[PDB]
Amino acid sequence: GAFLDKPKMEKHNAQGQGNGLRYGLSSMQGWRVEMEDAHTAVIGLPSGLESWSFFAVYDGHAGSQVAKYCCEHLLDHITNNQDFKGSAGAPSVENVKNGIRTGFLEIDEHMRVMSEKKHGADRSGSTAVGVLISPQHTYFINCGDSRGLLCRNRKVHFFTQDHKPSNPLEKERIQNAGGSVMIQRVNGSLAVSRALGDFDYKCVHGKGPTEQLVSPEPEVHDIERSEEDDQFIILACDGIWDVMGNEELCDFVRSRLEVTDDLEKVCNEVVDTCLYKGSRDNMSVILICFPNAPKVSPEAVKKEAELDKYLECRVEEIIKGVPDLVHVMRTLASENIPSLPPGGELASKRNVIEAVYNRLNPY
Ligand SMILES: [Mn+2]
Ligand SMILES: [Mn+2]
C-alpha cells in the first residue's frame, strides 16, 4: 500500500482574520503516498451573510476528487437551497440545520450525476467536519470520522461524535441495508459509516439516500455563542485525533497559544507533534480563535525558553559512540523531564531536540 520511505513534512498553511475571528491552518501529507485531505476557510459569506464564517476539514478516501469538490462547493450547496433560505430575512436555527442537511444530500446527488455523466473512474469518498459561525451561533457539522471541538472557559465544551460503523444506530442502518459490520468496517472494507461519495455503497434498492450502507446525512449542533467564554475551535482529520484525545489536544493548544499568537505555527506544532506520536496518515487542522482565546504570557514564553535550553544541554551531555536521534529521544524519555507541554509531551519538543542534535551531529 502507500507509505513513503520518509514522510513529506512540507506544511501548507493559511491564516486570516475578520468578524472578530482569527484563524490558522496546516495540512501535511506525512507518511502517505498521496495527499487526500482538503479544507475550506472563509470569513464573510456571500448573499447577505457577510457576518458569517465557514471552516471545514475533508478527509478524502480512495482519491481526492470528492474531498476537493466539497472544499470548493459544499458551502454554496448549503446556503443556496430553499431550506436554508427559509425564511424571513435571517435564517432560523431550523433553516440552518435543514439547510445543512439538504446541502449534504444535494451535493452528494450532484456529484453522483456528474460522475455518471462523465463516466467517472474514481470511487472516492470524503468525511466532512466544520463549523458555520453566525453572529450568535456556532453550528457544528459532522459527517464521518473527522472531528471538531469547542474550547470554552479552558474546557472542552463540545466535541463532535465520530460516525463509526460499529456505533449502534450506524450498525443498525447498515444491517437493514443488507450489509454487515465486520469488526469496525462496513462489509469488512469501509471504516466510516458516513461520507459524501462512496457511491458503490449507496446502491441499495428500496432504501432512501440516508438509509444506504454509507450515509451522507450530517449531524448538526447549534451552540449559542458566548463572547466572554468562547476561546477557540479545533477542526481536524483522524490523522490528528488517532493520536491525541480531546482534552490532551485542547490543553496542548492552550499551552501553545500562551507562547505564540502565530496560529499557523500553532497548527504546525500540532501536526508535527502528531507525526512524532506515530500518526502515519495525512493531517489537516484548522484553529479558529475567538477574542477571548488565551493570550501570550511572558511567564509562559520564559518557561519555554528555559525548557528549550534545558533540552539542549541534555542533548549535549547525552551525545557525550554517538547515539542516533532515536536513542537520544529514548534517553530523554527515561529521564521523566518535568514541565513538558500538556498533551504534547516529549513528542511536542522533538523539533527542538532534533535541531540541537543536528547542530552537534550534522553528518
Ligand atoms: Mn484520507
Ligand atoms: Mn485520515
From Swiss-Prot:
Lipidation (N-myristoyl glycine): 1
Location(s) in or outside the cell: Nucleus; Cytoplasm, Cytosol; Membrane
Listed InterPro entries: PP2C, PP2C_BS, PP2C_C, PP2C_C_sf, PPM-type-like_dom_sf, PPM-type_phosphatase-like_dom
EC number(s) recorded for this UniProt protein: 3.1.3.16
UniProt entry keywords in alphabetical sequence: Cytoplasm, Hydrolase, Lipoprotein, Magnesium, Manganese, Membrane, Metal-binding, Myristate, Nucleus, Phosphoprotein, Protein phosphatase
Binding site for Mn(2+) 1: 59-60
Record note on cofactor: Binds 2 magnesium or manganese ions per subunit.
List of residues binding Mn(2+) 2: 59, 238, 281
Membrane topology: Lipid-anchor
Protein name, entry field: Protein phosphatase 1A
Annotated organism of origin: Homo sapiens (Human)
